[PDB]
C-alpha cells in the first residue's frame, strides 16, 4: 500500500513528456514508479478512463497487481517487457495512426492484453497452453477486490472485451502467429485486407499483438543491443547470436512490419527499425 499511495498520489505527465508516443521508446532510464505513470498516461490518452468511467485508485492499483505478477528474476520476460509491449502498443496507435480503424472496446482490449501477455512467465527455460495460463492471470487480476477496472462497462461489453483480451493473449504464440500469417500476408499480397470483415479484423488484431510483443527487434541499434542481451541471459545463462538473430528476423519479423506498413504507412519506423537492426547483426555475423 506503500507503493500505491505514491502512485494514486501523482501528477502524470503528458505523453509528449513521457515519450511514449516514440517507437523508438526506452525503458532502461524508467524506475518501476515511472513505467507505473506511463501506464496510467496510455490508458487516459488512448480515451479508456473517460469512456469507461474508470476509477483512478482502481486503475492504479489494477497496474501494480499487473506489475507484481510478473517475476523480476527473469531476465527478459518481465514486467518491462510487458511495459514496453503496451508501449508500442500506444505507439502503434496514436504515431502509428491504427487507433481510427478500430473500436473504443478492441483498444481496451489490446492495452490491456498488451501489458497482461505474459504474466507469471518463468523464463522459457522452465516448462497455446502457455498463453492460457497468462490469460488466466490476467482474469483473476481484473476480477480481484479493487481492481476491476473493466467494472464500468455493461455485461455486453464486459463479454466482448474478455473475448478479445483471450484472443489477443493467445495470439501472442509464435506458433499461432506462424499458423495465422500466411493468410494476413496473402490477403495483403492481393490488396484485398478489408478491416470490415469481422474475420479478418480479429486475424489483424492478432498480427497486431505479434507486432507489438516483439518490438524491441525494431529498437534503436544500442536499444536492440541491450534487450538481446537480456534475451541472451534468459535463453542460455536461466557468437552464435548474431547469425540467430538475422534468422529471427528474416523467419519472423520483416515480413510482419512490412504487411503492418501496408496497413499503415505510419507504422513504418518499426519497419525501418528492424531492418537496421538486421545490418547490424548481419554484420556482426562475419
Ligand atoms: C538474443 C538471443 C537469442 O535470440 C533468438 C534466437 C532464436 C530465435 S528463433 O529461431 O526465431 N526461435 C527460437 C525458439 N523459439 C521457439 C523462439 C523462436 C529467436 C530469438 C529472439 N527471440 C525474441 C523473442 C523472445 C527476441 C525479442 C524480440 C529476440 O530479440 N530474439
Ligand atoms: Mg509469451
Ligand atoms: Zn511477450
Known amino acids: ?9 501523482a501528477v502524470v505527465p503528458s505523453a509528449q513528456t513521457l515519450k511514449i508516443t516514440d517507437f523508438s521508446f526506452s525503458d532502461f532510464e524508467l524506475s518501476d514508479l515511472e513505467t507505473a505513470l506511463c501506464t496510467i498516461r496510455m490508458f487516459t490518452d488512448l480515451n479508456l478512463v473517460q469512456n469507461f468511467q474508470m476509477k483512478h485508485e482502481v486503475l492504479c492499483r489494477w497496474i501494480l497487481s499487473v506489475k507484481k505478477n510478473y517475476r523480476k528474476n527473469v531476465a527478459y520476460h ?18 502509428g495512426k491504427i487507433q481510427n480503424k478500430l473500436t473504443d472496446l478492441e483498444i481496451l482490449a489490446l492495452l490491456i492484453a498488451a501489458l497482461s ?68 500476408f496473402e490477403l495483403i499480397r492481393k490488396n484485398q485486407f478489408n478491416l470490415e470483415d469481422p474475420h479478418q479484423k480479429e486475424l489483424f488484431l492478432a498480427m497486431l499483438m505479434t ?36 534468422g529471427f528476423i528474416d523467419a519472423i519479423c520483416l515480413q510482419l512490419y512490412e ?8 507504422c513504418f519506423p518499426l519497419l525501418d527499425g528492424c531492418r537496421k537492426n538486421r545490418q547490424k547483426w548481419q554484420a556482426l555475423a562475419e
Not at 514486467?79 to 504515431?95: E, G, I, P, S, V
Not at 525494431?218 to 538473430?245: H, Y
Not at 504487411?259 to 505510419?266: G, K, R
Open 1 to 9: 500500500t506503500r507503493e500505491l499511495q505514491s502512485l494514486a498520489a
Open 117 to 184: 501477455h505474459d504474466l507469471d512467465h518463468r523464463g522459457v527455460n522452465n516448462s497455446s497452453i502457455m498463453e492460457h495460463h497468462h490469460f488466466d492471470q490476467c482474469l483473476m487480476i481484473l476480477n480481484s477486490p479493487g481492481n476491476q477496472i473493466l467494472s464500468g462497462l455493461s455485461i455486453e461489453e464486459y463479454k466482448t472485451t474478455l473475448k478479445i483480451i483471450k484472443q489477443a493473449i493467445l495470439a501472442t504464440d509464435l506458433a499461432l502467429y506462424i499458423k495465422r500469417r500466411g493468410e494476413f
Open 211 to 246: 507486432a507489438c510483443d516483439l518490438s524491441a527487434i525494431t529498437k534503436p541499434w544500442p536499444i536492440q543491443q541491450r534487450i538481446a542481451e537480456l534475451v541472451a541471459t534468459e535463453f542460455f545463462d536461466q557468437n552464435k547470436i548474431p547469425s540467430m538473430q538475422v
Open 259 to 266: 504487411a503492418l506498413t501496408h496497413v499503415s504507412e505510419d
Open 78 to 95: 518481465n514486467w518491462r517487457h510487458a511495459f514496453n509491449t503496451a508501449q508500442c502498443m500506444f505507439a502503434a496507435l496514436k504515431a
